[PDB]
Every structure is written in structure tokens, then in C-alpha cells.
Amino acid sequence: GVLTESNKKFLPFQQFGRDIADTTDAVRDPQTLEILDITPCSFGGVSVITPGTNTSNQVAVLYQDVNCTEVPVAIHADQLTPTWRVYSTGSNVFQTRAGCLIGAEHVNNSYECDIPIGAGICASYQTQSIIAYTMSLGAENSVAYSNNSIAIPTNFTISVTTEILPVSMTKTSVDCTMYICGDS
Amino acid sequence: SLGAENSVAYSNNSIAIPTNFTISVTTEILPVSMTKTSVDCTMYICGDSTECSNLLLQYGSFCTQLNRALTGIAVEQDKNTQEVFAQVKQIYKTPPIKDFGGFNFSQILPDPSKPSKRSPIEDLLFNKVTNGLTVLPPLLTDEMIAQYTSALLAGTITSGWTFGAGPALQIPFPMQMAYRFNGIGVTQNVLYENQKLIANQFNSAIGKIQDSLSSTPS
Amino acid sequence: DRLITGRLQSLQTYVTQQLIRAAEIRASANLAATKMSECVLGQSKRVDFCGKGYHLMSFPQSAPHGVVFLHVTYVPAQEKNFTTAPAICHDGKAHFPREGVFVSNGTHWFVTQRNFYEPQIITTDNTFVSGNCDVVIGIVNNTVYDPL
Amino acid sequence: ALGKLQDVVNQNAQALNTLVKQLSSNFGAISSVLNDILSRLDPPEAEVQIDRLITGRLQSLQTYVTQQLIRAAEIRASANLAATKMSECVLGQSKRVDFCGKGYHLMSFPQSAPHGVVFLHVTYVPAQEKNFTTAPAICHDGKAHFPREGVFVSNGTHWFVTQRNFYEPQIITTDNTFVSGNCDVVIGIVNNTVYDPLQPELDSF
């Protein structure tokens, strides 16, 4: 865990602190009675954001539930290959609410979401490198409303859209006895 | 007692006809999404141990099955919201002057003073509702969901239903409500000849919703 | 081994229950989406789908993990007894209301709306003729005035 | 474009390979072949080993059966929606918005696909619009007039009446309108002439 100076108030004799889940969240010093928070060491997933291989071979990596500070220690940068060291550091380290994104250039723009990240952040590949941004929910519009105004079509289009719905699946059946036992 | 006993005055030559009407506003709630939680099998089952992981390698892809199922739930939780709210290609915006023939929508459309672009109803709603496990964030922030809600509300207020089926064609809101009365078999002139009363009942009914929601917790 | 078996079983039970609950939430979200498309982006003739009554419009509202629909409906009120007739015979011909229903306050016969009482005068434009008056049951005698 | 069908087929094929892959897992036994534990061990201990393997395989098969039992419900819900769509878009015209396609629905044509269906919704979408002045009513003789099947639009000087979804302006007669009340209660009423087809003819005859 990460023992940090706590601000809570234990009782004089109490030595342990547990949360709703019966997990220790505060500990007291055996010698000096210093009460300290216990926060589990960082952990999380590692996602690789990549345009299709038939499109490109660059990647950008995301670490969920981390402040960007602990990526170099947590990833074992010194232990992995020199290629992994590229995504353990760099200048383009952008922090989102989803975690820390290393390898994408945060921009001040908005487009359709292309590869989801989280908390409104979506990333894509345009000139020629990987970018990250905040999505725009379609073009803005102000309709010319007026107390004596209308809009009436004078032409029309006959469109044909396509909808697909799954109807059935394979009627697979497994023999429990022969599967578990075979001829035995 | 299932309910009040009631007897209709049926006959072979008696009809009853309405002479007035009441505009009723009522609230329907539907859950749309769920918390996206992804759990790692190894950290939950073994945690620190490495020998435990070697034994767990004998149980086959039990980790893969559980993780895959949980991620499927997570992606579905965002697909649901996307289908429910992102039904407008554009983002329609209310006109700067909110003069809509007497129908006051101020209780339902956002006011810039609130930091989040939320109407008073949405503020009441948010305020009222209160080891290898990670809660992933939603793909849409609550601000974005509110943005879709405002876009739909503006589209309906300013262009009727013409925007969900085609380009948004502006129509005067009293004229839109007349189209809607014609929709339920009541000729439009009833609305024109009663616009003040109709708008007033609509406004009062909209207002009562906040009180009916805040006091009643269930 | 025993601890791993137990913990694995607990995780499996959790995943299974979450999958079932997620299917329930998917159904609810699908119903919400249909409600948005059919009550908000249009007027619904479906009874009791967009609120109780004759649906007029619905204004959506967001919520934590959900959506709130405020339904606008027209509910008839202040009804009144009336005498009706399937038809009115004028010149030996049967006349039926084109868009309404014949009602009588006792003195005269009027055609009004099926949902709001605005009595009118029976003309050759408020009604249409079908055959003779020997077939309809309950037909009554009154004059079909012609503005021509 | 066939994402839904492919997802169903893949999810079925996968997880059917997971079950078979589990067939080569020890589950903490000495070997994942029942024959081998039998031909390398005496029954007193081969019994215990096979018992462990049976428990693991039973768990794996039960898990696969439960997953399939939930995916079957999902496909049932999809097929019930598709049967409803077939009935309400193919066998008739729907007034449900965004049910049979996006737009005003006209018809549909069904097509089949492996383990599923494909619908072609033919819809009517307005294309080119103008903007016009309008009015709730028209005053002619101290009586409010309203349209029967249309809306009152102006080309800037001439008030006309037209249908609500295609600009076809026609002359405002007493036939395409209807009189109700006076010109004092309506709000936004405008002044114009409701031509009666009778009096010009009467002057002619």
C-alpha cells in the first residue's frame, strides 16, 4: 500500500481503521501512535489505441485509473524492450478523466468520435499522427423560429435505408456424458 | 379494495360529450444505463501471489470468460445511451427570445446561470439521486447527455416533429399545437379560441412536476 | 485450491447476475429509445404509451443513468348527457355525420365533435346521405338545411 | 455493414472453442486425459484425480450453457422485434416515427440473410424548402376562417392555402376552409378575401 499521513481521528486505544468493505484504510504507528492512511498501490488496464494495420502501424497507449506520474515505475520501463520505453515517456502525455494517455497529441478541436476513450474524449488519426480531443455532438444549428414564419418543402426524396436484425443462432447441442467422459 | 365502484349510465340513445379539457403533464422514468465495472480475475482471486497464478493457469480461460463478459456489459452500457439520446444529427438551439405564444418552457430548457447547462428539473433530479475492481467512466459526460436533451427539446419546440423525419422546418409553436389537436380529433380552432387558458394550464402543469418529484422520494 | 475454488465461484455468480441485470437494463433503454422516437419526435396514436390520455407532445429530461419524459396530454373534462341518433331522415333519405355525432339539447339537433361539445347546425356539408330511411335503426326526423 | 449477424456468429463460435479448450485443462489434476490418469494410476487415487477433473469440466459446460441461455434470450428479443417490423412495415404502412426507417414511412421490402433478416425501408423525405409568412386564421366578414386540410401561407402579397408537407398553394375558397367564430378572439388573424365559387357564377347567370 501507500502509507500517507492521515487526517481522521482514531480513538486513543484503537489501532486499525476499516471502511465499508472491511478493508484497512488507516493504520496507527506501533511506536509513535502516528495514524496513517493506507491506499492500495496503483493498478489498472493498458489499452492500445491503433488505426487498422492496413491503414498504419503507429499506436498510442492508455493507462486507466492512474495519475500520469507513476507510469515509468509501474511499467518496468528499464525491464522491457527499448520499444516499450517509447510509450512509458515522451512529450505528448495527456491526462484524461479515464486515466493517462501517452502517445497522442491533445488538440483544441472537435470531430465525430472515432475511437472511444471515455469522459467525452475520443481519439483518431489525422495529419500524420494520433490525436486526442473532446467530441462535438454534431453541427450546431439555430432554426429561424418566428411567430409568423414557417418552412414548407417544395421537393422531396424517396430514400431506402437498410436495417439488419439477427433472427436465429446455430442450434448447437452438446452431449454432457461424452463431452465430460468420452468412452471412459 | 380494487377501486371506487362505478356505474356508467349506458342506454341505446344517450351519449356524453366533453365541454372542457385539462392539459395534463406527468412524468415517466426509464433507467437507460448501468455502472460499467470491470474486474480482473487474477487480482481478485490471487492478488499478490505468483504460485496461486500458476495453479490458476490450470483452470483454463475462466479469467478470459469473465473479463470478456464484463467488457461486453460495459460496451453495451454506452450503446444504450447512444441510441436513446443521439437521435439528432444536428444540435438545434432555442431562439434567443423565448416568446412562444404563452407556453413557458423555462422550467425544462437550460439556463446559463447554472454551471452545467441544465434546466431546473435536471438539477432537482441530480441533487435528489444519492482490489481489482475499476468503474470505467461513461463515454458521454453528463454535460453531453444534457446537450442532446436540449437539442431534442429545442427541435421539438421550434420545428415540431418535422425534424425527426426530415430537415428541421420552423413552425409557430401555437400553430404546432393546433396541428397536434387536429391529430387527436379536436379541430384546431379550439386551441386558437382558448390559447390563453391552454397555455396557462400547460405552464401550471409543468410547474407542479418539480414539487411532485422533490417531495416524493420513491 | 479450496480458496481459489470459492473465490472463483463468487466471481462467477457476480458476473452471471450482472449479465441478467444488464439484459433488463437493455430492454429498458430500448423502450426508452422507442419512447423518445415516438413520443418526442412525433405524436403517438398508441393508447397509454406516451402518458395516460391523448398524447400531444413529450419533453425529455436527463437523469443519472436514465431519462425522464414529461408527457403532455389532452384529457377531456366537464362532460354532459345528450341524446344521440345514428342518422337524421330529411326527405326520406338517411343522413350521417361526416365528422361528428348528432346530439340534441331537446329542441334542436346538432352535429358536434366526438371529443369536445361545439354544437353546429346540420347542413348538407356537415353530413352525407346514404339510401332511404327504412333500414337504419333509431333514425330520427329533422331538417337538413341547405345554404344553397 | 452486417455487424449484428457477424457478432452473433462470432460469439457463438467463440465460447464454443473455449469449452473445447477447457477439455485440455488439468483443473489441478495430474493430466487432462482421463485415459492417462487411468493407465498410470491405481483406482484408489485415479478416482480422486478424475473426480477433480469432472468437477472442473462440469463447471465449464454449465458456464457455457448459461451463457448460451442468455444469448438465446437476446436473439429472441431481436427476432420478436423483427417479426413486429415485418408485420408493421412490410404488411402495412407505419405511422410510428423511427420504427420503419428514418423519415415518413411508405413501405418496406424484406430480405433474408444467414441467421437473420434485412429490411429495406422506403421512406419519403422532404427536400427543398422555402420560408413563408403564415397566419392561424383569415378574417373575411367578421368571422374567423381556418383551413380544413392545410396551412395559410403567403408568397409575400398573396395569401394562399397549402398542405403541410408539399408546397402547392391554392386559392382560398370556402371549400378548402371552414368558418368558426369571429375575427376578435383568434390571435395573429390576418385579413384577406375568401372567394366563394358561387357569386361570380351567379353574376354570370
Coordinates of N, CA, C and O in Angstrom, one line a residue, chain A residues 163 165, chain D residues 76-86 99 119:
Chain A
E163 N -31.9 -2.0 -42.7 CA -31.8 -2.4 -41.3 C -31.6 -3.9 -41.2 O -32.1 -4.6 -42.0
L165 N -31.4 -7.2 -38.7 CA -31.7 -7.7 -37.3 C -31.4 -9.2 -37.2 O -31.8 -10.0 -38.1
Chain D
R76 N -33.8 -13.9 -29.2 CA -35.3 -14.0 -29.2 C -35.9 -12.6 -29.2 O -36.9 -12.4 -29.9
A77 N -35.3 -11.7 -28.4 CA -35.8 -10.3 -28.4 C -35.6 -9.7 -29.8 O -36.5 -9.0 -30.2
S78 N -34.5 -10.0 -30.4 CA -34.2 -9.4 -31.7 C -35.2 -10.0 -32.8 O -35.7 -9.2 -33.6
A79 N -35.5 -11.2 -32.7 CA -36.4 -11.9 -33.6 C -37.8 -11.4 -33.4 O -38.6 -11.3 -34.4
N80 N -38.2 -11.2 -32.2 CA -39.6 -10.7 -31.9 C -39.7 -9.2 -32.4 O -40.7 -8.9 -33.0
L81 N -38.6 -8.4 -32.3 CA -38.6 -7.1 -32.9 C -38.7 -7.2 -34.4 O -39.4 -6.4 -35.0
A82 N -38.0 -8.2 -35.0 CA -38.0 -8.3 -36.5 C -39.4 -8.8 -36.9 O -39.8 -8.4 -38.0
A83 N -40.0 -9.7 -36.2 CA -41.3 -10.2 -36.6 C -42.3 -9.0 -36.5 O -43.1 -8.9 -37.4
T84 N -42.2 -8.2 -35.5 CA -43.1 -7.0 -35.4 C -42.8 -6.1 -36.5 O -43.7 -5.5 -37.1
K85 N -41.5 -5.9 -36.9 CA -41.2 -5.0 -38.0 C -41.8 -5.5 -39.3 O -42.3 -4.8 -40.1
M86 N -41.7 -6.8 -39.5 CA -42.2 -7.5 -40.7 C -43.7 -7.2 -40.8 O -44.2 -6.7 -41.8
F99 N -39.5 3.9 -36.6 CA -39.6 2.5 -36.4 C -39.2 1.8 -37.7 O -38.3 1.1 -37.7
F119 N -34.0 -5.5 -43.8 CA -35.2 -4.7 -44.2 C -34.8 -3.5 -45.1 O -33.7 -2.9 -44.8

